[PDB]
Design a protein around this ligand. Sequence first.
Ligand SMILES: O=C(COP(=O)(O)O)[C@H](O)[C@H](O)COP(=O)(O)O
Ligand SMILES: O=C(COP(=O)(O)O)[C@H](O)[C@H](O)COP(=O)(O)O
Ligand SMILES: [Zn+2]
Ligand SMILES: [Zn+2]
Ligand SMILES: [Zn+2]
Lengths: 462, 461
Amino acid sequence: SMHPLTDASANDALHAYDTAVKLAFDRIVPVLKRLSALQHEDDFVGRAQAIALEELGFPLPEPILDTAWVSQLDMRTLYAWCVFETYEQTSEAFFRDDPLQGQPGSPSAEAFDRFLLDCGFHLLDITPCADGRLAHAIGFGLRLPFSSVRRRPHAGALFDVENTVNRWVKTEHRRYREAQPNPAHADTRYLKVALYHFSSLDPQHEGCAAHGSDDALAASCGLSRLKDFQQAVENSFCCGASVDLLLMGIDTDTDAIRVHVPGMDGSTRLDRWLDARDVYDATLGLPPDQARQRVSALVQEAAASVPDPGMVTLVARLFEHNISQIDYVRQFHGGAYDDAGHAERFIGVGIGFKEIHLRNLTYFAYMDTVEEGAADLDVGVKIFKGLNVSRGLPVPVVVRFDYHGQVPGARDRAVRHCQRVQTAIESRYPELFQQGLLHALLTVRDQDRHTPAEAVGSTIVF
Amino acid sequence: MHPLTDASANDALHAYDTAVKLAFDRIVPVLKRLSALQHEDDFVGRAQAIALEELGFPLPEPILDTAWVSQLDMRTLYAWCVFETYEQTSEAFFRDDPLQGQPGSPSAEAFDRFLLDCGFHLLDITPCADGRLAHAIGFGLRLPFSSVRRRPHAGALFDVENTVNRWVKTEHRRYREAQPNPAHADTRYLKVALYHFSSLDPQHEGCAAHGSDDALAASCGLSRLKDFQQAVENSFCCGASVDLLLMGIDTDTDAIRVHVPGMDGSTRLDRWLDARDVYDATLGLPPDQARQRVSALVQEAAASVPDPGMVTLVARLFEHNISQIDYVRQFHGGAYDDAGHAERFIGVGIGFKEIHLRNLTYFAYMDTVEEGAADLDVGVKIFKGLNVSRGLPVPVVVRFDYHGQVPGARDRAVRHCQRVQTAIESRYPELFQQGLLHALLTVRDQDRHTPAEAVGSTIVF
Ligand SMILES: O=C(COP(=O)(O)O)[C@H](O)[C@H](O)COP(=O)(O)O
Ligand SMILES: O=C(COP(=O)(O)O)[C@H](O)[C@H](O)COP(=O)(O)O
Ligand SMILES: [Zn+2]
Ligand SMILES: [Zn+2]
Ligand SMILES: [Zn+2]
């Protein structure tokens, strides 16, 4: 890679990972086209199974192939099935092989938690925008181990203030009772980050659709939620409780971040920021340790007003990491992603997917209640009415809910919550359903341990 | 062949009718060939090449490129092919003038002069909208299309009040431009009502707007004619009148019959002069005499002493219709086998300037669906038997004329078309959702002689 701070080996491993997962999804349609052409031939059911097993790595539903002759092979359902099975194998390998090398207990996960405490933060809770183009922001954009971070995605970065406050009490409680992540009377803070995005190449149409592609607006709402969380904590607990804040954006064309370096008490400005492109150039010609020393100087000078020193160290580390992602896009994507808009393979709805860390793989819509999250799901369906329905393909929806395995009943409740979402989806797009253009897979994840999600129902039935 | 038949004209018109009808009827056979090929590797390539050869255009690629999922969407291709065929048909009408009767054509200039000599400064014709009469002007009466206002209506029930308004507009143009002639000149506006009947099966193949009763269709057509005249005479001072002509046509043979009127439009409903008796009466005569005998026959069939120019003009229509009688004997055995409805698409809105062939278009006049949905429902039921019976969609072409001098009239017309489309999609949601009904939106600038313009479609990509 060109920049002396860039992790060339990591760019290689990351690039192979992205390429392999995308290829698995992209070979579905060529395989299914080939199958469609065989549906009148002699041993089609047998032939199809062996073809699918050999080129997709999993079989197809026997009763679909069996019943093709009545009307025709139901490719819409087969497409959904294959997307679902590919999601499922992808997901499995994530938990089993740790492609990002960031699982709990991994060297880089423990290391980042240690560095974080060294900067005076005992938990990094980041809300990116739920835009599928930001799904790699943690693992690729900031090169952080995914298990060292609380990732809480929302459309336009509008996280839930009340639930954040509660995550803070939980965190405080484990500090008091288990000294995890650290002792309770250590001088560390909860750090809440909001991460907006924008398009340098098409600043006006390809930005954050939840804020009308107005960069200034997405940054303002993002900061406004940060400030509310901070105020909520101070007003809700005795003895000067507080949190730290960080506002950031990322360019969906180049993956370069920009940061509004705050001053000690959270003071940040919306019109001033440090851009990673600018940092990258100021250091491109230096030895690593001198480049690193310049990043700190730049972050320090860029502070809205006198900043907290740990904040400088952490923020400097994020720029150092993003530099690798900047070279990544330059070295693998001509300096600008050809898929500037939405190109996602399936819609994910419910709780953020622990295991999705790839750009443009999943259009995510958060929803804890259906009658509360329909809007974002609607934006996602209309996106896919273009990506998929226009090609004759259905809209593959993957429902997710985490649960605490160590709580009796929790798994069954989450499974029953998956089903009310499915029931709600079926009511809401009744036409798309009827026609075979919308399908749902239900999944649940024991968040109490590092284990694969598990499928617990589907709109595909035999 | 009759001594008065224009042989070569009969060939040219036949060559035209068979050409356009071939274009439309080649569609199904092509789509049948494509359907057989949709599992082959090079399907898209082979289909495009078949369509170019056969229909002369290629197909929407999205529909071919995705046939492997749903299967090949024939209903939508068929509609799209009918629309594309209509566009090529229509564009070539204005480009090539197959009838040799556009504005400024020698034929049109000749006939405009002849109408003036007969004492008439405008010829306004309402045939029943029935698809079996769309060729009445160009084939049946051999008139240049542009020398004539054609105003079709179900059962020939034209708008009395709007016709008076057309008379007013005509006089005004005589006053201000002396076009077609000075206002003081002793000419009259001529309104014609053309009803039809079936000589082979009079009980069921007649004018369905009037229950296939010949008398009712004849008498309602006259009722409108009288009412128009009475309306002019009552609404303006001084002279203020119009001339009238009630005619029918047999849809089995294309013979006309004229109720020759007295000078003041005195028309008898029970007595007519049938072109078949004219035909037989003059068949053994050399042309010069045959023309004389047609004259004396029209003179003698008048209800009371006729106007001299009316006698001349009606004699010319008989002389002209005798060729069309020979036409149907030559190329249709003396009786069309498509005795009934065999139209290739529904047309709604204003009459189609460019449509002049028998059983090509089921036309439903309407300003809005809210009115004349009855007339549209009739067509839709018919195309359930013609197209939905065999799995094909019902193709609708909406047309509105607008004055391409009024600023924004084109815009107004386009929005009028979409207003109709919404109303149609609401009237037949079952067919529309099952993809068994599609609409093409066309507007035509009626201030000059250019082709209509396609402005939207239910087929969407
Ligand atoms: O970070 C999140 C939230 O969203 P995402 O899955 O996108 O990261 C997970 O809940 C982690 O497992 C937290 O760890 P724990 O549940 O043990 O506190
Ligand atoms: O009656 C007609 C033609 O009847 P049809 O359209 O049914 O053949 C009109 O005189 C003109 O054509 C209208 O406008 P324009 O002068 O532009 O043609
Ligand atoms: Zn087949
Ligand atoms: Zn966004
Ligand atoms: Zn009729």
